[PDB]
Amino acid sequence: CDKTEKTWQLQKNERLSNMVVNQLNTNGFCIINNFLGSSCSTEVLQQVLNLYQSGVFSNGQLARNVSVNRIRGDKIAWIGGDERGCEAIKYLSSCVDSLISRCNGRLGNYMITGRTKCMVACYPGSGLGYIRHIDNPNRDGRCVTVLYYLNPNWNSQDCGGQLWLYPNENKVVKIDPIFDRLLLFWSDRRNPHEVKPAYAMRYAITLWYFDEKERALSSQ
């Protein structure tokens, strides 16, 4: 994985941004399979596992900054990308940032000028999950949720852990958390979703992109 321009790649990236714009505006979510390729994705996974084994993950928290394991059962680490052993995570974030930048001005009326650090997450089996929720119900600035999944050879019948999305349609969209899949969806009340109980270690990275005007309301 060259973490640092081919013509075919540059043209593909334009095509991907056009798909993302259309799919988010039309359906409220977009799936991109094989986003980084297996070599780069393996490096991301290896760095996430090394971080987890190093004992730096805390409990996932709710908007009141408290944890209730029966509501949200993941362990998380906030990663900016420049920490030791995180170059592949930084590479992922740069690829997502480039994708979002190519969509700027075409995603609703949002103006995206910032995002969270990477939220690296593990649901450590044991039937842990995240009950149905909305990422941004109260105008906290988050406009697009991006998930990157890291689970090789995952079988949801055995291991659960699907993301179930309920696009604001009368139907559930059941999404497997498969290795090297990117998922984007509007963060607000249009997209309730839940992480179904996981029966194996389930890894993912989240980036939340902010709408500048709404995000200002959170300044302190």
Partner: peptide, 18 residues
């Protein structure tokens, strides 16, 4: 209710400018 179930977001001093 959904208000209490949202995932925590670090406050703006931790935001990454694009």
């Amino acid at each position: 209710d959904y208000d209490d179930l949202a995932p925590f977001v670090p406050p703006p001093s931790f935001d990454n400018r694009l």
